């Protein structure tokens, strides 16, 4: 079974999709592994933190060109593997296939898009249909996304999640408390963690997204201080420069899909955390 996973990975690197057959297989094993993981997954450095990919397969390939090949380089993606991009199927499968072959070398979080309702509006649902003729591969994958860890704590100091903070979550324990094994709710803690955005207005505000909230600097500082965190690491938001600092460096945004939707013209970035939790950024443009 190990020689097989290697094959599936070699294939997926040639942008060639796996068969409904194997995706069903890969997905159940990925479920077994992702179940034992915490809502606040422990991740030790060194490890490279990545943000949004959104099916932009060839950019994901350009990412590995810049941060090193798996499993020599350790990775942590903060979700949003599908939708918008033209290759949601190949992208998410390469990543899930990487997680099953190398549990300790890769960590995959859940983004607002690793859900069932949004994937039927932005791509992923229809793309599966154009490539497998039925909706099965989509069920195997959206079922799997229920098991994706909502967040990860790197070295007990750097807290990573897709979206951001919530008015109904003050401590890491509050998160470990939540039951994440379900579709993403329309309101609440689990929802906010995946939908909120840091803002430059104080306290809490109304998110223009229609879900989650906006949170100013004061909120982050409190959240950091109360949880002994040096930094909040998230994605979810387009950042032209590829990555962005805000809230007196309490928060950092990391976007890894260069030139989003093939129209934005933005750079992408990944954050390297070395053996000493020392950080460095790698900005990059879309691969030719």
């Amino acid at each position: 079974f190990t020689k097989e996973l290697d094959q599936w990975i070699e294939q997926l690197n040639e942008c060639k999709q796996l068969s409904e057959s194997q995706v069903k297989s890969l997905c159940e094993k990925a479920k077994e592994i992702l179940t034992k993981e915490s809502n606040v997954q422990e991740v030790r450095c060194p490890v490279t933190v990545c943000g949004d990919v959104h099916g932009q397969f060839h950019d994901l390939m350009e990412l590995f060109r810049i941060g090193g090949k798996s499993p020599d380089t350790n990775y942590l993606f903060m979700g949003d593997y599908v939708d918008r991009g033209y290759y949601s199927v190949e992208t998410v499968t390469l990543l899930v296939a990487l997680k099953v072959r190398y549990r300790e070398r890769i960590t995959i979080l859940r983004g607002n898009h690793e859900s069932r309702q949004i994937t039927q509006v932005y791509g992923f649902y229809d793309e599966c249909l154009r490539k497998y003729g039925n909706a099965n591969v989509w069920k195997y994958f959206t079922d799997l996304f229920d098991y994706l860890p909502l967040t990860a704590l790197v070295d007990g100091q750097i807290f990573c999640l897709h979206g951001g903070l919530s008015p109904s979550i003050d401590t890491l324990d509050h998160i470990r408390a939540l039951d994440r094994l379900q579709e993403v709710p329309h309101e609440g803690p689990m929802c906010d963690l995946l939908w909120s955005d840091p803002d430059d207005r104080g306290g809490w505000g109304i998110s223009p997204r229609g879900a989650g909230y906006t949170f100013g600097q004061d909120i982050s500082e409190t959240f950091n201080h109360a949880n002994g965190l040096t930094l909040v690491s998230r994605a979810h938001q387009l950042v032209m420069e590829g990555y962005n600092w805000c809230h007196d460096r309490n928060v950092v945004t990391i976007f890894s899909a260069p030139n989003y939707c093939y129209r934005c013209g933005n750079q992408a970035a990944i954050m390297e955390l070395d053996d000493t939790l020392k950080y460095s950024f790698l900005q990059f443009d879309p691969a030719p």
Binding site: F64, I66, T73, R103
Partner: protein, 581 residues
Amino acid sequence: SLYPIAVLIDELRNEDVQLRLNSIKKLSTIALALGVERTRSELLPFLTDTIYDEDEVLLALAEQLGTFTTLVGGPEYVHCLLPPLESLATVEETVVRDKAVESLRAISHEHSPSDLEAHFVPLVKRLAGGDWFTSRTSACGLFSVCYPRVSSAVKAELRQYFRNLCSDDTPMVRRAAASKLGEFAKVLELDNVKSEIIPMFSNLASDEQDSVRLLAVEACVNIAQLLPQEDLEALVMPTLRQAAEDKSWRVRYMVADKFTELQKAVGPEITKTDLVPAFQNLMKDCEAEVRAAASHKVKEFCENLSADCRENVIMSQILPCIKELVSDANQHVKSALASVIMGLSPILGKDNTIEHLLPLFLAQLKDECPEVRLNIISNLDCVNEVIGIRQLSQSLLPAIVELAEDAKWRVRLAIIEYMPLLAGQLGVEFFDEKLNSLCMAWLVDHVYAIREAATSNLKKLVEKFGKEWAHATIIPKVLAMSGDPNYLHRMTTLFCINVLSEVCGQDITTKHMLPTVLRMAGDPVANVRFNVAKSLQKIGPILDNSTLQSEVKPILEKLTQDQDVDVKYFAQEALTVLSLA
């Protein structure tokens, strides 16, 4: 069919009297069985007509007949070989007609002067004045062999047919005649070159068909040599100047292609008078195919101007034209020039090169088309042996260093691939001083692909300078990274040891790399540890078996007990592959 000839036949297939291929080549022997008399009376006639379209065969038969002179009775009977060769000359698939001619030309010399007139020329004519066209295309390569040895009267005759062949109603029969016009001109008396060849030439040069005209440029070279310097302006130059101006760029192309050759055929004075301006026009042609053909000739041409006017026409006539091309649109052209431009250095001096060429050298070394700067980089050898290596380093090093640390990696990757080139050209002492730094600096670049690039680059470098130079100049600094706190850098160290074992040899690998590899088996980060298993599986084969059993087998067995899943899996794999399991 009957023996012994029947042996050639292939009684097994389903053909039309086809012959055994592996037998037509073993022909000089069937000719030995039946005697010389019978080789003529029965073997030759049988071959003559028996001509199926089995090409692999017709070829051999044509080739084989060119060495059958002696198996037929020696010279006095050499002509028996004509009938079958005449045939083979009119076939199809040119490959065969060529052979038939090469052989006809071969045995022409065996023919005696009298037998030449009695059987050869007659074959030439019937072939020339034959109906079908191939019978004529091939007929053109048989004039130059028989002309010299026959009589004045037959010579005349031969000249007439060669003309009729030039003025043939068919483009092909004319192209053929044109490309053999030079050869034929070379064996005629001067008068007839002037009175007979010149007119034939002029006519072909002004042919309705350009496919014919471009083939008169090659003839011009040949005719232009046989004539004395004074006669050239009157009987040739007008025609050649017209060709360089021809409506068909194809014809102009041929003039730029055969330039250096015309330059010799014509002589220095005319080259200075008529050729330098033409050359200038060609470099400014509207069609890029021509500008490039010409640009390619630059170095060779200037090299050939007469020693005295040389340096002056160059700085005055040629050089301004070159500055123009370095800016040309078509990369086809920029490309052509770039591959030869720095070859002008010797012909201009350390002073001129440094002031007028180094600028152009740079303008191209920073061109988009990577091929262009690569051509400049591939030919530094001469520019370097003309001006001082310090003078070149003073004009090259900054172009490099400026790119070796630039915006996007890719542009940086591109500069890593000029290294083995710069090395093998500029020499090992230069590399150890001004380049070894940039190669080690890349081993620790932020972009992975760049570190990867610079890693395999070492192997390419050790191939250039050797295993000694590697242990003294490269291994010391590569091993230094094992101490680095970043795991990305420590793994980079093992990666350099994998590639370097391939070319450093068993001794250096065991003595100076294996220890560093085994030492890291206890690195704090899992990724380095499992990559240590991989590195042992890699370099294990180069190490003699004793070492493999005493020092490697142990460390691996330990790693198989490591906490981490992957170090364990890779430790095992390593053992199973090295057979130490």
